[PDB]
């Protein structure tokens, strides 16, 4: 087999080989035998010189259009002479040149990756095309510097490279939602030729954040006289997720007792906590309960918060006077110290607001004695004479130590007999 | 201050204290002084024995109805004597007993936790109620043995416990979707009393699985004569998620070239890959393309798979005989060795299916000569005499080396002249 190598895309008139010498034809015989290539197609690309007997390129040859991705491109040639008419055979090897640069069919590649994609997941990329073969084909892929993505290039069944995008670090759309990358494919030509593609990565949102309250817990003070409809506090919570998944609404915890719901209500949009009814420090001095903020995701994320409402005592009770026992009538002969009445006082308020003092006018022949807390006896403190006064209206005044103090008035009526 | 402790729910006649001796009353004069409890309410629960002067329980006292959740329960008592008329005061401390067991308001508690909940996330639980106070109130919560959940119990300023369920290890609904737990609350009484609640936690599904092919790649061999509509392979992929997120459908990759789409089709539900048109080993010997499986989730998860289809050569071409040149007429005086015809053969099949041998009948005065691959010249091999035979019909037979071989027949017609 006579084999001539010649590079593809060679100019018209390029020397391939001297077939006349290799077929053992005489030079003078060459001008007579009129050696020519047989076959209509091959006459477009090859020609035989009548003077030298050289096989020459007629029209440039494209190896890619002829053999595609085959490793070797060999063109069998047949020749004809006259006198006598004879046929000869030779093979022309078309040697590949690097007339193709790597090129991605689309130069804009867009990937949408979920925010919760696990590191180690591979994402396919469309590979560049290089119609050349051998070392002139694609030799490596490159990915521009970044912090979350790397390249994982796989070799498929024939030995072509298949590039895949590999997630190295977890994503977080709340920190970075978009990545702009450049992907490069380079062949092993001399010099290497390359082509690039722009890779835009989008991070899709997951509902991975619960709402966050402004403070971890709230403690509030309110006077027990506060009217219904007063705003105690406005709860604020934020959620960084997108759309309804970042939309915060407020409510009581599911386990909130009705004793809380009776006095407090929570506006679902504004988070304003209002007072719904009368408070009373004397019955309950504080309330502890939990509230929650929910996002509008499906399903929803929840966050709880602890609320404490402290009541402040108000001096809303005047002292209560109990006259336990009462003489009614007293002999004018009674010795000083005679008990006229037993008196008890109570004030339900706290601290100084509930501390009671008792008094009567000085000018009376009576006095107040106390042996135990909040207990007073009304006794005679001087002599009595019916002819002077037949009866006494003894004005008793109880007062608490609030500011200002509140007073209670009670009159003990006492008849005097002989 | 005279203070007597007495446990709540004590029977009638229980000894509280010797008030007379603490009030410093003469022992011989009790029947005269007639020490008595003052106040209608306190007279329902306490009475003074006239002979001994001891304060006794009349009707049993409920500490819970009196003080609720307060730590200390103190009842001021007032007493009255006659001869002389006097008032005395003492305090009774009502001591809590352990007459309340812990009790959850609901015996069935249900939690729905997302499969992708991060470890360390907390979930509220409805606390049990124990109306007692002090050591008789709830002292600890317990959670049955398990591997993913623990308790995080918070202590408030008054001593109330707030139980929270704490996720310790990551969940996976594809491995276990339901957890059955019992939650227990115990007080610190002697003996300790407790109550339980049934806790059912369910794991909600996330679309965290892409479909999985049975094999990482498939390689198929098919004869180039295979008829249209033949099933080459059935792709199988599973997706363990729930609902549409676990429903798999098949398709070609988005970038699949039309030369592939023209010959192969993929049923979206069954995954059967069928043949759509004629194959030809002589023009194309293999096809490589990617297929994908998508679930019905929103957004959809997909996994790609690489397919390679290799064609097998069939002996579907008999050799082709080309008679390049033919003398047609020959003089009987011509010397042996004269070339009568030029013959080239070709068979497009590969291997033994494409190797051609040539022959002619033995008895003829002709022979076949070959100087180049697949080129034969028909020459005279003996003397020729016109008077004997004026013309020859030379039967040339080409055969390939297939089993069974395929043959081609061509006759060279030759006239002889004088
Ligand atoms: C993707 O997945 C698909 C589906 O997978 C299946 O379905 C899913 C849902 C799962 O359950 C999965 O586990 C399943 O596998 C899968 O396609 C299947 O591929 C299988 C092979 O890989 C194939 O199995 C064959 O089934 C034949 C019967 O099928 C009939 O019934 C089924 C179910 O009802 C129908 O779908 C189907 O259309 C048919 O109607 C079965 O006969 C084959 O076994 C014979 O052949 C074997 C090798 O060819 C051989 O090893 C076996 O031993 C058996 O050989 C026969 O043995 C009997 C008894 O010994 C002989 O009978 C006796 O003969 C003696 C004389 O010899 C005497 O006459 C006695 O009297 C007589 O009883 C008989 O002669 C033997 N035959 C031969 C030819 O030798 C084989 O098991 C499934 O059908 C496929 N399913 C479908 C739905 O198509 C794909 O493979 C997966 N894809 C990939 C890429 O893997
Ligand atoms: C939950 O969030 C809400 C809302 O938050 C606000 O909106 C968010 C979108 C975001 O932007 C966030 O940053 C905002 O703060 C909270 O409610 C807000 O609370 C703050 C603080 O408690 C209040 O600020 C006060 O604003 C008034 C003016 O408010 C008028 O105009 C507002 C619009 O700009 C309206 O929204 C109001 O309705 C009202 O019409 C200021 O006057 C206050 O400053 C003065 O008083 C404080 C002490 O209270 C002093 O420290 C300051 O120095 C100011 O004093 C004045 O100074 C001038 C000049 O020196 C002097 O001439 C005056 O005499 C001084 N006056 C006095 C009285 O000394 C505050 O800045 C917001 O009004 C309130 N907004 C709403 C809508 O309610 C809420 O607190 C939060 N929840 C929790 C638990 O934190
Ligand atoms: C939340 O939902 C309401 C309707 O309920 C809508 O008007 C609002 O725009 C949404 N987003 C925010 C941030 O409030
Ligand atoms: C997928 O959805 C279709 C809708 O009709 C249903 O018929 C089919 O059974 C589903 N897939 C599986 C694997 O069940
Ligand atoms: C692509 O890459 C090749 C090799 O790195 C370069 O030679 C070319 O200029 C292009 O940048
Ligand atoms: C790679 O770089 C080329 C320019 O060399 C661009 O055309 C391409 O879009 C990518 O950025
Ligand atoms: C709750 O726990 C207490 C103390 O462990 C038991 O006595 C009771 O039976 C219940 O199981
Ligand atoms: C805890 O266990 C008790 C039985 O000891 C049940 O009655 C209760 O409902 C919970 O399961
Ligand atoms: Ca070319
Ligand atoms: Ca080339
Ligand atoms: Ca190239
Ligand atoms: Ca995030
Ligand atoms: Ca998010
Ligand atoms: Ca959210
Ligand atoms: Ca009050
Ligand atoms: Ca008060
Ligand atoms: Ca008061
Ligand atoms: Ca009780
Ligand atoms: Ca208890
Ligand atoms: Ca109790
Ligand atoms: Ca899972
Ligand atoms: Ca899942
Ligand atoms: Ca899935
Ligand atoms: Ca064929
Ligand atoms: Ca064939
Ligand atoms: Ca053949
Ligand atoms: Cl590479
Ligand atoms: Cl609510
Ligand atoms: Cl009274
Ligand atoms: Cl009065
Ligand atoms: Cl006495
Ligand atoms: Cl009594
Ligand atoms: Cl505990």
Residue numbers in the entry:
A (entry chain B), B (entry chain A): 1 to 418
Paper text:
Clustered protocadherins (cPcdhs) are a large family of cadherin-like proteins named for the clustered arrangement of their genes in vertebrate genomes. cPcdhs play roles in many facets of neural development, including circuit development, most notably neurite self-avoidance in vertebrates, and tiling. Moreover, Garrett et al. discovered that neuronal survival and postnatal viability are controlled solely by γC4 suggesting a function that is unique to this isoform (although it presumably requires β and/or other γ carriers to reach the cell surface).
The biophysical properties of C-type cPcdhs pose a number of interesting questions: Despite their more divergent sequences compared with alternate cPcdhs, AUC data have confirmed that C-type cPcdhs αC2, γC3, and γC5 form trans dimers using their EC1–4 domains. However, γC41–4 behaved as a very weak dimer in AUC (KD >500 μM; Figure 2—source data 1), nevertheless full-length γC4 can mediate cell aggregation when delivered to the cell surface by coexpression with a ‘carrier’ cPcdh. However, the 2.4 Å structure had an apparently partially disrupted EC2:EC3 interface resulting in a total buried surface area of just 2900 Å2. Left, surface views of the two trans dimer crystal structures highlight the difference, with a gap apparent in the EC2:EC3 region of the interface in crystal form two that is absent from crystal form 1. The difference between the two structures may be due to differences in the pH of the crystallization and its effect on the ionization state of the three histidines present in the EC2:EC3 interface. The differences could also reflect distinct states of a dynamic interaction, as has previously been observed crystallographically and explored computationally for other cPcdh trans interactions.
